[PDB]
Ligand binder design. Structure first.
Ligand SMILES: *[C@@H]1O[C@H](CO)[C@@H](O[C@@H]2O[C@H](CO)[C@@H](O[C@H]3O[C@H](CO)[C@@H](O[C@@H]4O[C@H](CO)[C@@H](O)[C@H](O)[C@@H]4O)[C@H](O)[C@@H]3O)[C@H](O)[C@H]2NC(C)=O)[C@H](O)[C@H]1NC(C)=O
Ligand SMILES: *[C@H]1O[C@H](CO)[C@@H](O[C@@H]2O[C@H](CO)[C@@H](O[C@@H]3O[C@H](CO)[C@@H](O)[C@H](O)[C@@H]3O)[C@H](O)[C@H]2NC(C)=O)[C@H](O)[C@H]1NC(C)=O
Ligand SMILES: *[C@@H]1O[C@H](CO)[C@@H](O)[C@H](O)[C@H]1NC(C)=O
Ligand SMILES: OC1[C@@H](O)OC[C@H](O)[C@H]1O
Ligand SMILES: [Fe+3]
Ligand SMILES: [Zn+2]
Ligand SMILES: [Zn+2]
Length: 341
């Protein structure tokens, strides 16, 4: 009962979880699902306790009663005096990236180019970029804006899945979990890295993390930031250092969600867990680090300083904010009081 059940999405996270489970003398245990949605279901049922989510899935979750608990927080130059765990969360920039070498490509010349998405329903990989394209286009036929794409979660037999590749054998094509080569921030960015697609929808941290020898993965080894460009809304191309003035929007940090009749207990065990395998714990670098997955953002993003406390005891709408909630609303009608299960 001081014991928490985590929901691991996919085989790779199942493995980083069972590892965490050992180091905890099992104050943590794992449930496994092949997709984030099933993970949400397991939690509803009470068969699992929590998982960390991109704001896109939180929205879904909140309709079915789960609640924000703790948020991922990364390093800041403002809000420095404050400890991490109490520090306000800053959010992240949803950017759109292209290869510099690919001149002329602009936000205005994207109809029919090739896209790389983190997955369906996520914030920077989907709901932000598609909400805009649907919204400037007057259409809902957004499945027809990109001749070809990789968008984990969409129907395999569709064009949206044409650009994806499955694990080592080209099995599990387009599944919305890391087993897919082009799944999530890094997959999506590799997708452009290797010139599979013309554009990629990821967060800003992603470009910086896999370039100029930061990633050490063989596909990111020789990647050099200057070879990339951000596409702005005013149809302009700025270096990746201008993220602040050339972003599509800022997004709510991913966060741990749970059931309300559970929140308090997930929180308590977690801060303790965080104190031990977190950024400066009795056992991170020696025995086990909760935020190290090796450039693969397994369970938590790899750039998490710590899981922060919230503040006003958010209800997800507030946690996600009225801007974002609407962006998601006008978009899902193209498919409002709800759940989704
Ligand atoms: C886009 O997203 C990127 C990725 O998150 C942001 O870039 C990072 O910004 C941080 C603060 O804004 C930089 O962080 C600090 O803390 C570290 C150490 O505590 C400092 O130094 C390290 O020094 C060694 C030796 O040179 C190197 O290994 C490291 O690369 C680092 O330089 C650093 O001085 C700073 O005080 C962080 O370094 C930086 N990360 C990278 C890879 O550049 C970026 O701000 C964000 N942009 C926007 C507009 O939001
Ligand atoms: C494209 O679809 C709609 C069309 O407008 C966009 O939503 C609009 O977003 C703005 C800002 O969220 C809303 O304005 C707000 O009004 C409220 C009162 O309702 C006020 O409290 C706020 O201060 C703010 O000014 C506007 O009402 C809203 N309209 C609708 C119908 O949602 C949507 O965001 C667009 N999608 C994207 C991705 O840009
Ligand atoms: C297991 O939980 C109890 C309660 O906090 C605690 O005594 C102990 O530190 C935990 N063990 C580990 C390895 O976290
Ligand atoms: O709910 C909100 C919040 O908590 O932060 C500022 C926002 O703009 C908003 O919509
Ligand atoms: Fe995200
Ligand atoms: Zn802005
Ligand atoms: Zn409130």
């Amino acid at each position: 009962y001081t014991r928490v059940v985590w929901c691991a999405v996919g085989p790779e996270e199942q493995k980083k979880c069972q590892q965490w489970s050992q180091q905890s003398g099992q104050n943590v245990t794992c449930a496994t699902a092949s997709t984030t949605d099933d993970c949400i279901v397991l939690v509803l049922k009470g068969e699992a306790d929590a998982l960390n989510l991109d704001g896109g899935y939180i929205y879904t979750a909140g309709k079915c009663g789960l609640v924000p608990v703790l948020a991922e927080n990364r390093k800041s130059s403002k809000h420095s005096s404050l400890d991490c765990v109490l520090r306000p969360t800053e959010g992240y920039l949803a950017v759109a990236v292209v290869k510099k070498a690919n001149e002329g490509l602009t936000w205005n010349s994207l109809k029919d180019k090739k896209s790389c998405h983190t997955a369906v329903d996520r914030t920077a990989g989907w709901n932000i970029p598609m909400g805009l394209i649907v919204n400037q286009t007057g259409s809902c036929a957004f499945d027809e804006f990109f001749s070809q794409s990789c968008a984990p979660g969409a129907d395999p037999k569709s064009r949206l899945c044409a650009l994806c590749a499955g694990d080592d054998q080209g099995l599990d094509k387009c599944v919305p979990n890391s087993k897919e080569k082009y799944y999530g921030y890094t997959g999506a960015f590799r997708c452009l890295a290797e010139d599979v697609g013309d554009v990629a929808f990821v967060k800003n941290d992603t470009v910086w993390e896999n370039t100029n020898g930061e990633s050490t993965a063989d596909w990111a080894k020789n990647l050099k930031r200057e070879d990339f460009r951000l596409l702005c809304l005013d149809g302009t191309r700025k270096p990746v250092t201008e993220a602040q003035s050339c972003h599509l929007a800022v997004a709510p940090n991913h966060a741990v969600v749970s059931r309300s009749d559970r929140a308090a207990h997930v929180e308590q065990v977690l801060l303790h867990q965080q104190a031990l395998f977190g950024k400066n714990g009795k056992n991170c670098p020696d025995k086990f680090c909760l935020f190290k997955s090796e450039t693969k953002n397994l369970l938590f993003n790899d750039n998490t300083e710590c899981l922060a406390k919230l503040g006003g005891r958010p209800t997800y709408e507030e946690y996600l904010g009225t801007e974002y909630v609407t962006a998601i609303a006008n978009l899902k009608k193209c498919s409002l009081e709800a759940c989704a299960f």
